[PDB]
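We emphasize that the prediction below concerns an isolated chain of 227 residues; any contacts that depend on oligomerization or on bound cofactors are therefore not represented. The input was used exactly as deposited, without trimming of termini.
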Amino acid sequence: SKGEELFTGVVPILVELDGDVNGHKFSVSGEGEGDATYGKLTLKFICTTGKLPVPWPTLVTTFVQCFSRYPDHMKRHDFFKSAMPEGYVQERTISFKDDGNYKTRAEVKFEGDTLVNRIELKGIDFKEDGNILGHKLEYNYNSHNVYITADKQKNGIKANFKIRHNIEDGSVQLADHYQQNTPIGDGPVLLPDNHYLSTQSALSKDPNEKRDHMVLLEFVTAAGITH
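Result of the prediction step, given as a token string:
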């Protein structure tokens, strides 16, 4: 795609989120850069409203799959880059097993040469002292498969996957994800064959940062198609 060519080098990224989870209103700003050649993301996020009222890991999937590494032979399946620069809408329902849900609506597009992800997040029916509002999740992140399918009537894609958040007692908090993406612009976009994105993420802290924050290093490769 034409859009593919926008990602051959390192691209600056901005993430802005406004959230309301059980009436706790918050905002997050993130900065960093992506190198889709290597499937690579590096960002730092700051909660600009004070303390983040949910655990940082729960927001990772919400906080730019255009930076996934599509192998050359899978170029024709890369919806995400094909929608650029005009971008795509990304909507999800994230269901935390036996707890509440997030519903997110985001727009991912270029502002100049910077790739931007603007998100509105709404969370409801969380348990006051469950794993989310009670901050019982470990500060770490597992490796997942994101299963993608074409959504032809929307000129886009769907994704369905399970995220596992480790709980501090050694257990796991499942977060079922259902996702739909829709292009914004009028250029042709790629409608993929079934495939998945294999993810890995490492969370850290900046030792000199006293605001509530998250440093994220993530690698994602598309897979599941041989030719």
